[PDB]
Coordinates of C-alpha atoms in Angstrom, one line a residue:
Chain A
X1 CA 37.1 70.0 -10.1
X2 CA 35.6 72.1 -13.1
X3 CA 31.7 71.5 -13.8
X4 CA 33.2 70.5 -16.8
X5 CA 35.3 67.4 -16.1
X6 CA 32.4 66.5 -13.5
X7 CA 30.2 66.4 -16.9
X8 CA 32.7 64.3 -18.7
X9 CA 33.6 61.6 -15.8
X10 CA 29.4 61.0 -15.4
X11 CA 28.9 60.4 -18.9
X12 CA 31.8 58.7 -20.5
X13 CA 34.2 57.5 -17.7
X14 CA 31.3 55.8 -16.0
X15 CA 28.2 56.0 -18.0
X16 CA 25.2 53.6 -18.6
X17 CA 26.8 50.6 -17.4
X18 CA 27.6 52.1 -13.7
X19 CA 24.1 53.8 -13.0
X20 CA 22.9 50.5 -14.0
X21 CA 20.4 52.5 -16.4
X22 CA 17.7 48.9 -17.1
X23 CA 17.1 49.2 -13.8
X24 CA 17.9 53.2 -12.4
X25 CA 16.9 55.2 -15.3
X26 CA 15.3 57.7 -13.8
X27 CA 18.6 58.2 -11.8
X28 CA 20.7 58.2 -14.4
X29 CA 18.3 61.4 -16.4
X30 CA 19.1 62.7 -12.3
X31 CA 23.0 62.6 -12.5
X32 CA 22.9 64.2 -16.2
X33 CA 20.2 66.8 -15.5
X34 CA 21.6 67.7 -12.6
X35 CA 24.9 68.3 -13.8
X36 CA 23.3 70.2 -16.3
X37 CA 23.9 67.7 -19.4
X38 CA 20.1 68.7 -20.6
X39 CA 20.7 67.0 -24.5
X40 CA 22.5 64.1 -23.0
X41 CA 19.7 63.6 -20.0
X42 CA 17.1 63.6 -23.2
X43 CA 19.1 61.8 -26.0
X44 CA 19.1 59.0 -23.1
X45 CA 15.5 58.9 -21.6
X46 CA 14.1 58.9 -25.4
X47 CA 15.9 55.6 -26.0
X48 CA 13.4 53.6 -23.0
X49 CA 10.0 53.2 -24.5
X50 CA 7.3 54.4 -21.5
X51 CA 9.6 57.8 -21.4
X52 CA 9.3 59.0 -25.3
X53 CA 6.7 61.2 -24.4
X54 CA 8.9 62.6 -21.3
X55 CA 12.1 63.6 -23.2
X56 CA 9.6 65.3 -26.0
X57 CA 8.3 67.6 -23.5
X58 CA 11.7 68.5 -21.5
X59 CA 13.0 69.2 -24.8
X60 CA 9.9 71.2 -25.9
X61 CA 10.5 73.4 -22.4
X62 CA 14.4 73.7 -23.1
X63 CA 13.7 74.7 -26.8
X64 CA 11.2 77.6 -25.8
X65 CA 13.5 78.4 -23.0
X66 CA 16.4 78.7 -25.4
X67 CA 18.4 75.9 -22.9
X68 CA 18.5 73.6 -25.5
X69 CA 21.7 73.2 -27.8
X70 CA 20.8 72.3 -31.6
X71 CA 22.5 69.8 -33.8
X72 CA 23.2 72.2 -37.0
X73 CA 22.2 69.2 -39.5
X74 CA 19.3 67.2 -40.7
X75 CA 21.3 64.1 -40.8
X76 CA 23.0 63.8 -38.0
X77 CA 22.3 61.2 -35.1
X78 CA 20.1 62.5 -32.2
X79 CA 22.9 63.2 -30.1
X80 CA 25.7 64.9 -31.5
X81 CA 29.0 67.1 -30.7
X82 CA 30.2 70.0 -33.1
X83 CA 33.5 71.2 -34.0
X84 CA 33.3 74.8 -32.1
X85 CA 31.4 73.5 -28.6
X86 CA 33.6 73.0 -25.4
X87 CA 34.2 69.1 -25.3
X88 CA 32.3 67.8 -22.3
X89 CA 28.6 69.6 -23.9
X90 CA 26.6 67.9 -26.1
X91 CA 23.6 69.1 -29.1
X92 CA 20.6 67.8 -30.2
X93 CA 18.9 67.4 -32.9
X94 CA 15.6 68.5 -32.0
X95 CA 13.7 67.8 -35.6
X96 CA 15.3 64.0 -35.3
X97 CA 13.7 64.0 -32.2
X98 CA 10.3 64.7 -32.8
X99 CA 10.6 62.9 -36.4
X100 CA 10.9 59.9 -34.5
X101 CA 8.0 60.8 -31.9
X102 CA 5.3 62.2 -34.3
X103 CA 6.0 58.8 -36.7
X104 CA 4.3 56.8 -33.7
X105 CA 0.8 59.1 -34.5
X106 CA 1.7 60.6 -38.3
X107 CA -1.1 58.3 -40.2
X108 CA -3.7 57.9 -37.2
X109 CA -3.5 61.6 -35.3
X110 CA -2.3 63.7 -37.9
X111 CA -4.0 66.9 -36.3
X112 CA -1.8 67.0 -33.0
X113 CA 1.5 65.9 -35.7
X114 CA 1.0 69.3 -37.1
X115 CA 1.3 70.7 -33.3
X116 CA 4.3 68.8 -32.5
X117 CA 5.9 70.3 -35.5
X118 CA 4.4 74.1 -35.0
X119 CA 7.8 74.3 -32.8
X120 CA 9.7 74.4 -36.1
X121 CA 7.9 77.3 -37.3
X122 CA 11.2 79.1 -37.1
X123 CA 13.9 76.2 -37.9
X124 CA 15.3 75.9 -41.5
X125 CA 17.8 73.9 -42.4
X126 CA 21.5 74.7 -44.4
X127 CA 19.7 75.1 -47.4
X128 CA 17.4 77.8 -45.9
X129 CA 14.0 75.4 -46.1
X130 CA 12.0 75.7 -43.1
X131 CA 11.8 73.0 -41.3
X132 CA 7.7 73.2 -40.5
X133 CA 7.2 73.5 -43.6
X134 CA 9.2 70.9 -44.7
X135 CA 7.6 68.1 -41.9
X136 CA 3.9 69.0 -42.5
X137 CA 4.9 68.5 -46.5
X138 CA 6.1 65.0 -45.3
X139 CA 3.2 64.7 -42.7
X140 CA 0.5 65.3 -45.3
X141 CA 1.7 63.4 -48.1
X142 CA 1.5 60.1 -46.1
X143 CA -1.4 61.0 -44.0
X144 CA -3.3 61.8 -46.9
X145 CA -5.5 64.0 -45.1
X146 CA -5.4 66.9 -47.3
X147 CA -9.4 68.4 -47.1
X148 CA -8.7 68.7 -43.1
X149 CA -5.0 69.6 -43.0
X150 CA -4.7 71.8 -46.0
X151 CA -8.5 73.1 -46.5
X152 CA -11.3 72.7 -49.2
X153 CA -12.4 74.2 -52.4
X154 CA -16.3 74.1 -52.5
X155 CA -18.4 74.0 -55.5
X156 CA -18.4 78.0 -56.2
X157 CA -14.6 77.8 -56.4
X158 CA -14.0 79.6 -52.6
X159 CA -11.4 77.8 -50.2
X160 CA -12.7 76.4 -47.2
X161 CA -9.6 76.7 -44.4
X162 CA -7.9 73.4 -42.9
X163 CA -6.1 72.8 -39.4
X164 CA -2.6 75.0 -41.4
X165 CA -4.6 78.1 -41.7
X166 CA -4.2 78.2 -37.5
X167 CA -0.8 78.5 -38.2
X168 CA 0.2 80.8 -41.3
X169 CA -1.4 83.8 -42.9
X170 CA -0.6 82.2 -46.5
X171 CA -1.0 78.3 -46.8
X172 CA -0.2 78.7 -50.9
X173 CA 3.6 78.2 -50.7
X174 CA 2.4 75.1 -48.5
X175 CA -0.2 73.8 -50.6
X176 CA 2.2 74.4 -53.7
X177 CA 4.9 72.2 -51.8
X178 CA 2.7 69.4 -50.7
X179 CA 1.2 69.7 -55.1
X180 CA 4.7 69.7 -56.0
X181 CA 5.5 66.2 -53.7
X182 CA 2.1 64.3 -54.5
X183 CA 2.9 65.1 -58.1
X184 CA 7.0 63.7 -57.7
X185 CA 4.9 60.6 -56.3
X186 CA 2.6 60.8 -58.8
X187 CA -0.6 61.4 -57.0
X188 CA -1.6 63.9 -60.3
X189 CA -5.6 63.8 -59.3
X190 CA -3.9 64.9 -55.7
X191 CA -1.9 67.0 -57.1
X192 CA -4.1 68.8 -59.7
X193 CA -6.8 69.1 -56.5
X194 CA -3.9 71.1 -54.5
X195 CA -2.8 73.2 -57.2
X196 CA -6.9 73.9 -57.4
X197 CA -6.8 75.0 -53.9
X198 CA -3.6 77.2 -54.3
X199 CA -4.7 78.4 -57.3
X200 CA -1.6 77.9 -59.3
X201 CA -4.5 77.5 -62.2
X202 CA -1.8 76.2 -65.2
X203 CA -0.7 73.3 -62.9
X204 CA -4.0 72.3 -62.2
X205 CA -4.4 72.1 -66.6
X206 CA -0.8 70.3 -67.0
X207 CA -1.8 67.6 -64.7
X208 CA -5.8 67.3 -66.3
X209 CA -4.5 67.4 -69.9
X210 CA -2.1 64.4 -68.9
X211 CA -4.8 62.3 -66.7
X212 CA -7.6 62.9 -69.7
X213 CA -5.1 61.8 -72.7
X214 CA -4.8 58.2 -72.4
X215 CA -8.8 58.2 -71.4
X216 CA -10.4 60.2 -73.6
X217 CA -11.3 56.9 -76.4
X218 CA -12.4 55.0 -73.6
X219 CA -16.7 54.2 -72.7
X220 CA -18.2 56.2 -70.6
X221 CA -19.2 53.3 -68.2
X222 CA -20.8 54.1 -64.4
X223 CA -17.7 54.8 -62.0
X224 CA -14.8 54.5 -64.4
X225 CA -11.7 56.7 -64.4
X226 CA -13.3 58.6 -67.6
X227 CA -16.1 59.8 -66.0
X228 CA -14.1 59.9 -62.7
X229 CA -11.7 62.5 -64.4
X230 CA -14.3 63.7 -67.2
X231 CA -16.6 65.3 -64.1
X232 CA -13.8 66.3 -61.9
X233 CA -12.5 68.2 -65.3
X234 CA -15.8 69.8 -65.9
X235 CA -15.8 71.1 -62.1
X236 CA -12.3 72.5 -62.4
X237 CA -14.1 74.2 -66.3
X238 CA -17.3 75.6 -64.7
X239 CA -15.3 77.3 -61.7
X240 CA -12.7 78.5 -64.6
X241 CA -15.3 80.0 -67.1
X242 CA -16.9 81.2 -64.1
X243 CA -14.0 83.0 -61.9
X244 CA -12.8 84.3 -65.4
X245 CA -9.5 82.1 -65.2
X246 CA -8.0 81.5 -68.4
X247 CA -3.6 79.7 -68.2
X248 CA -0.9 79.5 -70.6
X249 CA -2.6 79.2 -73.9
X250 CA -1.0 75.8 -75.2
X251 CA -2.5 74.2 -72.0
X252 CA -5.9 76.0 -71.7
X253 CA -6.7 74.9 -75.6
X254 CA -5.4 71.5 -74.9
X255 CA -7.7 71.4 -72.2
X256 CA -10.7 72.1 -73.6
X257 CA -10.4 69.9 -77.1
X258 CA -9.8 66.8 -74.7
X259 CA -13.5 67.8 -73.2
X260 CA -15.0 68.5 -76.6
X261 CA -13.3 65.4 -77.7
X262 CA -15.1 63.4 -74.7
X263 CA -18.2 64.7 -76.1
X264 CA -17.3 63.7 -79.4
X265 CA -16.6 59.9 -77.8
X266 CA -19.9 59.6 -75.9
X267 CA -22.0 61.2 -78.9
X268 CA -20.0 58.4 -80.9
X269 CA -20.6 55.7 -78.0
X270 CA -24.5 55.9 -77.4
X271 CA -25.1 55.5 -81.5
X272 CA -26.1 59.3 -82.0
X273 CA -23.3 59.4 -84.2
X274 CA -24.7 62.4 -86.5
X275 CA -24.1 64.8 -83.6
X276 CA -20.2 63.6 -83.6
X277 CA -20.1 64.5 -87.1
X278 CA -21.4 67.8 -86.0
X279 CA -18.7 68.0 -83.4
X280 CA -15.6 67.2 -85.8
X281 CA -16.7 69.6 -88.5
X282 CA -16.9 71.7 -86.0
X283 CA -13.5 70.9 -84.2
X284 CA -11.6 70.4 -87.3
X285 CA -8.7 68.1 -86.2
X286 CA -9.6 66.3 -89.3
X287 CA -10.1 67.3 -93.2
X288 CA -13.8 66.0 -94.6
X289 CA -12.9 68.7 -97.6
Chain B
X1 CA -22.5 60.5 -39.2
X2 CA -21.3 61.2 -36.2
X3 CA -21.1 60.9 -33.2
X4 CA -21.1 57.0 -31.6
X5 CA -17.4 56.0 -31.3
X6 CA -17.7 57.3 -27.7
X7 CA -18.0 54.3 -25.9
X8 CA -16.1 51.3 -28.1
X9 CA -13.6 50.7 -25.6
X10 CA -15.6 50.1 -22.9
X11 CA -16.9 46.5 -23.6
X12 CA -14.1 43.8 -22.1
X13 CA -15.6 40.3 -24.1
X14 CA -17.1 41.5 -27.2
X15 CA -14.2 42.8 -29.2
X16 CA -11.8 40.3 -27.6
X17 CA -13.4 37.2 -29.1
X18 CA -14.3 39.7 -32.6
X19 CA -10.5 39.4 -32.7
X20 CA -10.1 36.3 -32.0
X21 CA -12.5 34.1 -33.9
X22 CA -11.2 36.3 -36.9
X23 CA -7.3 35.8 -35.9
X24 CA -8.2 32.3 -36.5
X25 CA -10.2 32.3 -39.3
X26 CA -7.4 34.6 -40.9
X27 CA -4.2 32.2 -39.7
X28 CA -5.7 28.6 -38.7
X29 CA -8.5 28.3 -41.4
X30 CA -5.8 30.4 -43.9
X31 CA -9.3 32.1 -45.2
X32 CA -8.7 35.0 -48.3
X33 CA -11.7 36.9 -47.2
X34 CA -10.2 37.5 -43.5
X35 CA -7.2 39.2 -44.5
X36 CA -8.3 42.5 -45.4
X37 CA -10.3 42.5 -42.5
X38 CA -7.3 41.3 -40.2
X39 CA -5.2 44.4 -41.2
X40 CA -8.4 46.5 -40.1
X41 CA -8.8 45.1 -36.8
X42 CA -4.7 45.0 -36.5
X43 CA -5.0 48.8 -37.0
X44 CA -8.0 49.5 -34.6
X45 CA -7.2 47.0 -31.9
X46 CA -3.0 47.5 -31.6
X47 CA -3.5 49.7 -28.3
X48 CA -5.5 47.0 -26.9
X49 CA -2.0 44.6 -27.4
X50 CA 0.2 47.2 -26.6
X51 CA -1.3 47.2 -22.9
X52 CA -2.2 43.6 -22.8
X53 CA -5.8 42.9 -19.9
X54 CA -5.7 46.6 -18.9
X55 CA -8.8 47.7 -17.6
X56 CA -10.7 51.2 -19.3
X57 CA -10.3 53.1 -15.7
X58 CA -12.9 54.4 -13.4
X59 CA -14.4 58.3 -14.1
X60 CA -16.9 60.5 -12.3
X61 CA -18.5 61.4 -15.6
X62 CA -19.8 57.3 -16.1
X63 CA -20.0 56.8 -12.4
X64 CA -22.6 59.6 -12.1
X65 CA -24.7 58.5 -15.3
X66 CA -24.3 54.8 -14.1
X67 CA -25.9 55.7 -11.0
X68 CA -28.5 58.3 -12.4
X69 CA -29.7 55.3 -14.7
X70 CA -32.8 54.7 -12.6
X71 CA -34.0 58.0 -13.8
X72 CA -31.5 59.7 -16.6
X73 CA -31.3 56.1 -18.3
X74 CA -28.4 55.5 -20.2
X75 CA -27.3 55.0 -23.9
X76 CA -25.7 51.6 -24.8
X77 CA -23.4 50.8 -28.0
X78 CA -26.4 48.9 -30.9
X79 CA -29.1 50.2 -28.9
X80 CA -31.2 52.7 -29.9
X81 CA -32.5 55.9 -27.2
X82 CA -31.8 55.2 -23.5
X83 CA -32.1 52.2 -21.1
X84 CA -33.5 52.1 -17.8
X85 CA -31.5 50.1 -15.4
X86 CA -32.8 48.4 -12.5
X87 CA -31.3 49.4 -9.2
X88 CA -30.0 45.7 -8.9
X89 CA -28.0 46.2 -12.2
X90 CA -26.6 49.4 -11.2
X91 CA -25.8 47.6 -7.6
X92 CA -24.4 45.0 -9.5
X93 CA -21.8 47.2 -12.1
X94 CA -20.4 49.1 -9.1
X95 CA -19.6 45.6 -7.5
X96 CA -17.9 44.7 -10.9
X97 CA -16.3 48.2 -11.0
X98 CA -14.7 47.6 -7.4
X99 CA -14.0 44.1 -7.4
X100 CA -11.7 44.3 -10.9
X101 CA -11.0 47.9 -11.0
X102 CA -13.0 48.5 -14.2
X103 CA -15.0 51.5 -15.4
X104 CA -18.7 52.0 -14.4
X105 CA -19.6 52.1 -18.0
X106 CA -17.3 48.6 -19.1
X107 CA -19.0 47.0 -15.6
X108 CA -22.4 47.8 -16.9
X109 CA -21.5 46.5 -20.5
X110 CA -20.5 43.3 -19.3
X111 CA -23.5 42.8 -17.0
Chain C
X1 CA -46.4 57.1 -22.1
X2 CA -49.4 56.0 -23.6
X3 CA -50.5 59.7 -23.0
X4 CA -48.2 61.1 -24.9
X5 CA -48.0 58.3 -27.8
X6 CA -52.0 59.6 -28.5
X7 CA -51.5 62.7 -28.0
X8 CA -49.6 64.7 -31.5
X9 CA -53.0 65.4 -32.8
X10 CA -54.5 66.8 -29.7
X11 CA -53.0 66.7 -26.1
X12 CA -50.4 69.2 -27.5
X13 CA -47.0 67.9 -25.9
X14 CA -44.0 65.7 -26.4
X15 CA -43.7 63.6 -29.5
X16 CA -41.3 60.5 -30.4
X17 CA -39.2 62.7 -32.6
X18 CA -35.2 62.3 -33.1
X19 CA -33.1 64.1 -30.0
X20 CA -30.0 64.8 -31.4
X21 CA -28.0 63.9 -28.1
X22 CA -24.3 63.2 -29.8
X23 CA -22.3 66.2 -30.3
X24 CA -18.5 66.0 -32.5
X25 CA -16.1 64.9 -30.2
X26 CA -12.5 62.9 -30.6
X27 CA -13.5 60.0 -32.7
X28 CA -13.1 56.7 -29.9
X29 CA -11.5 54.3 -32.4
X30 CA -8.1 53.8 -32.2
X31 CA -6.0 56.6 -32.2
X32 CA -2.2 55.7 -31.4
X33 CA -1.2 58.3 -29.0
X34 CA -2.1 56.7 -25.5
X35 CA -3.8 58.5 -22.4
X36 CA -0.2 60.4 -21.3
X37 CA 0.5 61.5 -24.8
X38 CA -3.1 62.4 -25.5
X39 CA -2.7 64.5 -21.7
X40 CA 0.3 66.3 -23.4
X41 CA -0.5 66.5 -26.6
X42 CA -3.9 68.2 -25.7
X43 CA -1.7 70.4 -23.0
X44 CA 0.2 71.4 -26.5
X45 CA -3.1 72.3 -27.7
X46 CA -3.5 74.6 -24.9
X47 CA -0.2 76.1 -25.5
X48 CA -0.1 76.4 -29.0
X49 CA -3.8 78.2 -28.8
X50 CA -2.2 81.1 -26.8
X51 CA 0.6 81.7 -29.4
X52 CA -1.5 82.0 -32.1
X53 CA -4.3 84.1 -30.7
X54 CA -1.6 86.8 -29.5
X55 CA -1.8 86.0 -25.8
X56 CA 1.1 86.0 -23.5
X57 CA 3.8 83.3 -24.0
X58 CA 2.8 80.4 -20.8
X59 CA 4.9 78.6 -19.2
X60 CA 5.4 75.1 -20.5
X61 CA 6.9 73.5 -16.9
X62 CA 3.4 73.6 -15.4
X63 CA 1.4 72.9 -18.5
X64 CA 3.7 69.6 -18.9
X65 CA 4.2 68.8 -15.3
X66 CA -0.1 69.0 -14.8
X67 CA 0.8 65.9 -17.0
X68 CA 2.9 64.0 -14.0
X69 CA 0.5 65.2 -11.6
X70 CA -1.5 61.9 -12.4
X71 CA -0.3 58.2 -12.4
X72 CA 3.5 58.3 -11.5
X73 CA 5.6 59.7 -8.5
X74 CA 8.9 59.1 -10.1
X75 CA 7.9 61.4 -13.2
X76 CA 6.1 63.8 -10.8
X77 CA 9.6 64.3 -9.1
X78 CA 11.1 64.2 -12.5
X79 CA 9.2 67.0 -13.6
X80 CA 9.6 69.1 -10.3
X81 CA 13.5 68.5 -10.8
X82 CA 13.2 69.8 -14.6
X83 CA 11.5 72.6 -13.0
X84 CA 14.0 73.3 -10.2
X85 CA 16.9 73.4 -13.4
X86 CA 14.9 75.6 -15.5
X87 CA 14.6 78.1 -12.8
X88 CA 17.1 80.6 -14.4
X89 CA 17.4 84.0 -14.6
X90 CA 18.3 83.9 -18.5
X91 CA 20.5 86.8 -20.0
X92 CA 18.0 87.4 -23.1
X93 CA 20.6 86.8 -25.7
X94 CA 20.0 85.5 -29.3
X95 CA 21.9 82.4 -29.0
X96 CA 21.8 79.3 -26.7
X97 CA 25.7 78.3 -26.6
X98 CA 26.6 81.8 -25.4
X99 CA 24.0 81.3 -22.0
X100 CA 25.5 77.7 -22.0
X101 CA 28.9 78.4 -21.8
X102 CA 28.2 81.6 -19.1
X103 CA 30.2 81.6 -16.6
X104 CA 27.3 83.3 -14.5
X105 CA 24.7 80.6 -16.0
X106 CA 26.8 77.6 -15.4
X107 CA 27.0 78.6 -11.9
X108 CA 22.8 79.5 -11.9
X109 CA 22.1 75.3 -12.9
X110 CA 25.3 74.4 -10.3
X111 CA 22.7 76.6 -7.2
X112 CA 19.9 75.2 -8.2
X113 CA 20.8 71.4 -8.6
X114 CA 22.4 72.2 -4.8
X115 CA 19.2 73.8 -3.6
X116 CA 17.2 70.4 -5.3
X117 CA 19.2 67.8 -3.9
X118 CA 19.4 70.1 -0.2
X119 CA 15.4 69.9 -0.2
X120 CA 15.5 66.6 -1.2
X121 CA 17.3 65.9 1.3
X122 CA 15.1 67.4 3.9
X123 CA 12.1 65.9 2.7
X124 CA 13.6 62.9 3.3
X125 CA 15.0 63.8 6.9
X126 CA 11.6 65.0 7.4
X127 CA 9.9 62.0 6.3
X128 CA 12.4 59.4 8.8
X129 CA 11.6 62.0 11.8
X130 CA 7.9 62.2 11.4
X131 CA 7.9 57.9 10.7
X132 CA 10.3 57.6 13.9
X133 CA 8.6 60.7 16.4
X134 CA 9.0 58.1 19.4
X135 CA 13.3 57.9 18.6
X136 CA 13.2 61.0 17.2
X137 CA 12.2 63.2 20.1
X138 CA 11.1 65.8 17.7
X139 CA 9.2 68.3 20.5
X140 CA 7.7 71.8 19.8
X141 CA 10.4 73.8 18.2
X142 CA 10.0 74.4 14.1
X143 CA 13.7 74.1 12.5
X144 CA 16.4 72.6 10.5
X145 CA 18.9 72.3 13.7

């Protein structure tokens, strides 16, 4: 008797069906953890509902303890077996794992997600991404928390810190990914916010320029997206003019005329009428010569 | 505004008919006006179904203010400052408590 | 009472004024972890904490174990035999598969799940002598034979 074919005869020759696991289970996590089937013991007492919470921590221990064999792959199922390990070992995939735990709490307790997934602060995947950063820029995007999780500009234009800034020296390639995703899902006031916050300041003017274009013509009514976006594009101009932030020049002019061009519509709107004459001679996107 | 959540698990009748009065309103009356509220109250009250009559346990920390509540006085969910108990009421909630199993702080919102 | 409720404008004490007595604490709506996974999650707090403040590395058996040290026996001896198998002199290598495959290793998890189930087993010899002293015949001399 190898360890090895001991392994092997518990887990496939007799398996769930003999340890009558429905009833047993903790005695069937016994057999497996005792013969040292760690992956296997956890890939099985994350299946029973009460026991989630269980097979996260083990697996949390065996991770930090380096004990735990990793599933090289995203994709695969939580178990798995790979074409170089001796036959009667197992892997698993430790992100699947807590992917499937954290999505219990990702929309309700977002803050201890972002713990959960602090134990892939090292993991990438096979395109080099890591894999923290890749989970809080899923966590995030449907927990919408972004002033708590991400951090805060105030008024004056400084960033207020979020829960991340516990857990990196830099949160801009973070803030820029999370940007980047709202903006693929088009959440561009979201977007245009984060790209504030990460200062990527032509981003923030490419998403603006966009969200102001089809609003411009419209009246200025009480709590309407033009004075929604109108004020939100002032803030984003005051903090500019006064940080002394000027973007790609095509962009940064654009921006700008769609103000003065709000101006012009609400000078136009409440009758005064002469004053938007004396914007458009001044703008000169018409000929009155 | 913040804090007051603290305590709105203690209290075993008042949510429970909250739900249920609104369950039917939303399903057996069909009403419009219930069914963004039912999604709400889904989303608060789904640990309450998820362990189905299980009592809010027993803690030193209400057990010592529930007794205290002759003098300390204690602070009730609506109410505004703190309440004086009698020492019958107190009597009373730890009788409740150890007749159901059911925190000091749930016996004394049900009395 | 009605001392004190005259007494602002010349008595020279307490007044009626707002006492700010609630402090920010966990929010008690619904949040979906439950009381276990709220226990762990909050002993993850207090792991995580250490890391990034620079502090020595803790050990995660006890942090998560002082989770089964509450409602359930069969996860309290769950935990003490995840303990027991994580009792291992680990080679400090760079890669897990290597101290998996160890000859040395695989003997190490082989020892200890020996020494678990020979304890076990005299906790429960223990347990039907000292329920059974009158059979037993036990007397007063301490040992395994």
């Amino acid at each position: 008797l190898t360890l090895s074919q001991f392994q092997k005869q518990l887990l496939e020759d007799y398996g769930e069906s003999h340890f009558t696991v429905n009833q047993q289970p903790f005695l069937y996590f016994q057999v497996l953890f005792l013969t040292a089937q760690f992956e296997a013991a956890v890939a099985f007492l994350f299946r029973m509902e009460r026991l989630r919470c269980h097979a996260v921590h083990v697996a949390l221990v065996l991770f930090e303890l380096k004990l735990l064999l990793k599933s090289s792959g995203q994709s695969a199922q939580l178990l798995s077996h790979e074409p170089g390990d001796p036959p009667c070992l197992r892997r698993l995939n430790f992100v699947r794992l807590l992917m499937l735990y954290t999505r219990k709490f990702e929309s309700t307790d977002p803050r201890e997600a972002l713990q959960y997934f602090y134990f892939l602060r090292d993991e990438k995947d096979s395109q080099g991404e890591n894999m923290f950063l890749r989970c809080v820029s899923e966590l995030v995007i449907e927990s919408r928390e972004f002033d708590m999780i991400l951090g805060k500009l105030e008024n004056d234009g400084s960033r207020k810190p979020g829960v991340i800034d516990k857990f990196t020296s830099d949160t801009k390639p973070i803030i820029n990914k999370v940007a980047s995703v709202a903006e693929n899902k088009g959440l561009f006031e979201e977007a245009a916010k984060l790209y504030d916050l990460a200062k990527n300041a032509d981003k923030v003017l490419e998403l603006m320029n966009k969200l102001l274009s089809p609003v411009v013509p419209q009246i200025s009514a009480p709590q309407s997206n033009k004075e929604r976006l109108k004020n939100m594009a002032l803030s984003i101009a005051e903090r500019y003019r006064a940080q002394g932030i000027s973007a790609n020049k095509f962009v940064d002019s654009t921006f700008y005329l769609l103000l003065d061009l709000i101006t012009f519509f609400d000078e136009y709107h409440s009758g005064h009428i002469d004053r938007a004459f004396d914007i458009i001679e001044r703008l000169k996107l018409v000929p009155l010569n | 505004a913040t804090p007051l959540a603290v305590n709105s698990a203690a209290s075993l009748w008042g949510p429970y008919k909250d739900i249920w009065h609104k369950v039917g309103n939303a399903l057996w009356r069909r009403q419009p006006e219930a069914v963004h509220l039912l999604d709400k109250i889904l989303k608060k009250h789904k640990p309450d179904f998820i362990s189905l009559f299980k009592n809010p346990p027993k803690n030193v920390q209400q057990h010592e203010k529930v007794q205290k509540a002759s003098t300390e006085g204690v602070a009730i969910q609506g109410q505004q400052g703190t309440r004086l108990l009698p020492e019958q009421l107190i009597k009373e909630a730890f009788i409740l408590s150890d007749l159901f199993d059911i925190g000091e702080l749930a016996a004394v919102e049900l009395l | 009472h009605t001392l004190l409720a005259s007494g602002e404008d010349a008595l020279d004490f307490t007044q009626e004024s707002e006492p700010s007595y609630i402090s920010d604490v966990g929010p008690p709506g619904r949040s979906s972890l439950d009381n276990i996974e709220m226990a762990y999650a909050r002993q993850i707090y207090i792991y995580n904490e250490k890391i990034v403040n620079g502090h020595l590395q803790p050990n995660l058996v006890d942090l998560c174990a002082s989770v089964a040290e509450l409602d359930d026996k069969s996860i309290s001896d769950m935990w003490t035999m995840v303990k027991q198998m994580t009792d291992v002199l680990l080679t400090p290598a760079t890669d897990a598969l290597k101290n998996r495959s160890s000859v040395e290793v695989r003997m190490e998890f082989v020892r200890q799940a020996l020494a678990y189930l020979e304890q076990s087993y005299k906790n429960y010899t223990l347990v039907t002598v000292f329920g059974n002293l009158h059979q037993a015949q036990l007397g007063g001399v301490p040992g395994t034979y």
